[PDB]
């Protein structure tokens, strides 16, 4: 007998360039927690249902997890774009959802069953602008690009634009693209003609990486910030050596000295031969929230005897009250499921000259 927890992430489509890191973190969590006896001796079982890259696929994944797989709760989905459409399904069904990395404004407000462990754009994004200004205090002109079809990208770009204004910089253009675009020559040229000192990009991974590459090909020599959608080594293959120097804010640090981060990090490094990425840590934290909440609930009200609809409701109620020492740091939730998290960082892509390899260097 095991306790089923649903994992609804992008395992296929270009969204999987982000989702696969999340899957990796979730699998590390499953082993970590089951090796510690699961929920008071009862193992958990992660049940994966691929969302693919759109809303319909996410709705289908959630419905399958809820109705066929009988899960006690869901971790997912990968994108805020998907969450706004699908999370209301879980809300109506009274099934908890813990979002690992969805950072658009308004996610926890979807309802009483929606929480997230990922700090939102309003507190994550401004740090990369400040870091750019530290590296070049003479930045004056900023060009901003965003994916107009993606909910998170639109939420993120609003924060970047406000931060640019608040820092006293000139916003010379805001250019739009689609996440499915591969070619950005017109928008890139239009921006380059305005002589920006800083370019900020809010998109996802393939699109963001292609845009970075093209900006450099077209002669742009200034600073570049990527938003959360570019926060994966999967961009390295796309922009190659021309990824070098991109600044990306982080809600996780491999060097954070929490005991569980040490264990998580060591497990990750031993397997994948590199530092754990943010998205992996966030997915681990989401699973941790469920395991530790299930343990707390089970101690007060043995879960093997609770019928599923009540188990879901009691688990949701419990998880919202918990305090968790996670790879992300000590976190907890507000009454509406927003994360409470203290520390943020900025990293910078450092490519080897040949462009075939790179890493994220954390700024001090
Ligand atoms: C995987 C991440 C890039 C997702 C993004 N933070 C969002 O809210 O959609
Ligand atoms: Cl295109
Ligand atoms: Mg909520």
Which atom in ligand 1 lies closest to the alpha carbon of residue 121?
A: 6
Pocket of ligand 1 (CB under 6 A): 18, 78-80, 101-104, 152, 228-229, 279
- Vertex 64, ends 60 and 65: CA angle to 5°? 120
CB half-sphere exposure, 350, CA atoms < 13 A: 7
Output the six-digit token pair for 235.
């961009």
CATH class of 1-120+254-342: alpha beta
Ligand nearest to the CA of 97: 3
Which atom in ligand 1 lies closest to the alpha carbon of residue 150?
A: 9
Which atom in ligand 1 lies closest to the alpha carbon of residue 19?
A: 1
Output the six-digit token pair for 153.
């990208």
Torsion of CA 82, 43, 267, 275, to 10 degrees: 10
Nearest to 121 by CA among 103, 108, 135: 103
Asked whether 207 and 177 are in contact (CB, 8 A), the reply is yes
Q: Which of 80, 97, 105, 328 to mutate to test the pocket of ligand 1 (most atoms within 8 A of CB)?
A: 80
Other Cβ atoms less than 10 A from the Cβ of 44: the count is 20
CA 185 – CA 59 distance, rounded (Å)? 35
Which atom in ligand 1 lies closest to the alpha carbon of residue 231?
A: 3
Q: Which of 15, 58, 152 to mutate to test the pocket of ligand 1 (most atoms within 8 A of CB)?
A: 152
SS (H, E, C) the chain: CCEEEEECCCCCCCCHHHHHHHHHHHHHHHHHHHHCCCECCECEEEEECCCCCCHHHHHHHHHHHHHCCCCCCEECCCCHHHHHHHHHHHHHHCCCEEECCCCCCCCHHHCCCEEECCCCHHHHCHHHHHHHHHHCCCCCEEEEEEECCCHHHHHHHHHHHHHHHHCCCEEEEEEEECCCCCCCHHHHHHHHCCCCCEEEEECCHHHHHHHHHHHHHCCCCCEEEECHHHCCHHHHHHHHHHHCCCEEEECCCCCCCCHHHHHHHHHHHHHHCCCCCHHHHHHHHHHHHHHHHHHHHHHHCCHHHCCHHHHHHHHHHHHHHCEEEECCEEEEECCCCCEECCCCEEEEEEECCCCCCEEEEECC
Radius of gyration of the chain (CA): 20
How far separated are the first and last CA of the chain, in Å rounded? 47
Nearest to 98 by CA among 308, 331, 254: 331
Which atom in ligand 1 lies closest to the alpha carbon of residue 15?
A: 1
Please report the sign of the dihedral spanned by the C-alpha atoms of residue 242, residue 245, residue 249, residue 250.
Answer: positive
Query: In which residue are the tokens 């395991």 written?
Result: 291
> Residue 336 C-alpha to ligand 3 middle, in angstroms?
4
Are 1-120+254-342 and 121-253+343-364 equal in CATH topology?
Answer: yes
Output the six-digit token pair for 362.
């954390």
| Residue with CA closest to ligand 1 atom 8 | 102
| Residue with CA closest to ligand 1 atom 9 | 79
> Residue 152 C-alpha to ligand 1 middle, in angstroms?
6
> Residue 309 C-alpha to ligand 2 middle, in angstroms?
46
CA 127 – CA 4 distance, rounded (Å)? 38
Sheet holding 323-326, edge to edge: 323-326, 329-333, 339-340
- Vertex 106, ends 9 and 279: CA angle to 5°? 35
Q: Which residues touch 8 (CB under 8 Å, ≥6 apart)? A: 49, 50, 51, 58, 61, 62, 65, 74, 75, 76, 77, 86
> Distances from the Cα of 123 to the Cαs of 216, 251, 279, 327, in angstroms?
29, 9, 17, 18
Experimental determination approach used: X-ray
Please report the sign of the dihedral spanned by the C-alpha atoms of residue 228, residue 234, residue 240, residue 241.
Answer: positive
Nearest to 214 by CA among 245, 177, 188, 243: 188
> Residue 160 C-alpha to ligand 1 middle, in angstroms?
15
> Residue 210 C-alpha to ligand 2 middle, in angstroms?
10
Resolution in A: 1.1
> Residue 312 C-alpha to ligand 3 middle, in angstroms?
14
Where in the chain are the domains? 1-120+254-342, 121-253+343-364
Output the six-digit token pair for 223.
């600073």
Question: Can the peptide bond before residue 133 be classed as cis, meaning omega within 30 degrees of 0?
Answer: no
Burial-class residue 92 by CB neighbours within 10 Å (0-12, 13-18, 19+). Answer: exposed
Other Cβ atoms less than 10 A from the Cβ of 89: the count is 18
| Residue with CA closest to ligand 1 atom 3 | 229
Asked whether 80 and 151 are in contact (CB, 8 A), the reply is yes
> Residue 316 C-alpha to ligand 3 middle, in angstroms?
10
Other Cβ atoms less than 10 A from the Cβ of 59: the count is 20
> Residue 20 C-alpha to ligand 2 middle, in angstroms?
24
Fold of 121-253+343-364: Rossmann fold (3.40.50)
Output the six-digit token pair for 267.
């497990």
Which atom in ligand 1 lies closest to the alpha carbon of residue 107?
A: 8
| Residue with CA closest to ligand 1 atom 5 | 102
Q: Classify 229 in phi/psi space as left (phi over 0), alpha (psi -120 to 50) or beta.
A: alpha
> Residue 101 C-alpha to ligand 1 middle, in angstroms?
5
Asked whether 185 and 218 are in contact (CB, 8 A), the reply is yes
CB half-sphere exposure, 60, CA atoms < 13 A: 10
């Amino acid at each position: 007998n095991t306790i089923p927890i649903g994992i609804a992430l992008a395992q296929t489509s270009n969204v999987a360039l982000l989702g696969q890191e999340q899957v990796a973190g979730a699998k590390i969590a499953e082993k970590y927690f089951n090796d510690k006896g699961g929920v008071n001796g009862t193992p958990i079982k992660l049940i994966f249902q691929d969302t693919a890259g759109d809303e319909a696929g996410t709705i289908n994944a959630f419905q399958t997890l809820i109705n066929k797989d009988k899960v006690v709760g869901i971790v997912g989905p990968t994108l805020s774009q998907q969450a706004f459409s699908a999370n209301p399904i879980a809300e109506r069904a009274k099934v908890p959802v813990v979002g690992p990395s969805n950072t658009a404004k308004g996610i926890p407000e979807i309802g009483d069953y929606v929480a997230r462990v990922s700090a939102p754009v309003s507190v994550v994004a401004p740090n990369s602008v400040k870091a750019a200004l530290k590296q070049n205090p003479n930045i004056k002109k900023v060009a901003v690009f965003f994916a107009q079809n993606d909910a998170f990208s639109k939420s993120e770009t609003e924060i970047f634009q406000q931060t640019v204004k608040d820092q006293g910089l000139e916003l010379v253009t805001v250019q739009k693209f689609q996440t499915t675009d591969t070619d950005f020559q017109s928008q890139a040229t239009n921006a380059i003609n305005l002589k920006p000192d800083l370019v900020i990009i809010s998109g996802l991974a393939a699109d963001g990486g292609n845009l970075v590459r093209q900006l450099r090909e077209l002669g742009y020599q200034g600073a570049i910030i990527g938003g959360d959608g570019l926060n994966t080594s999967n961009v390295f293959a796309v922009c190659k050596a021309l990824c070098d120097g991109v600044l990306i804010a982080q809600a996780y640090s491999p060097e954070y000295t929490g005991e569980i981060n040490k264990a998580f990090r060591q497990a990750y490094v031993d397997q994948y031969k590199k530092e754990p990425p943010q998205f992996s840590a966030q997915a681990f934290a989401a699973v941790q929230v469920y395991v530790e909440s299930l343990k707390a609930l089970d101690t007060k009200n043995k879960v093997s005897k609770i019928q599923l609809p009540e188990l879901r409701t009691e688990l949701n109620k419990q998880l919202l009250t918990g305090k968790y020492n996670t790879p992300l740091g000590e976190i907890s939730f507000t009454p509406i499921g927003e994360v409470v998290q203290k520390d943020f960082y900025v990293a910078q892509i450092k490519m080897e000259k040949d462009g075939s390899q790179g890493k994220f260097t954390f700024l001090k």
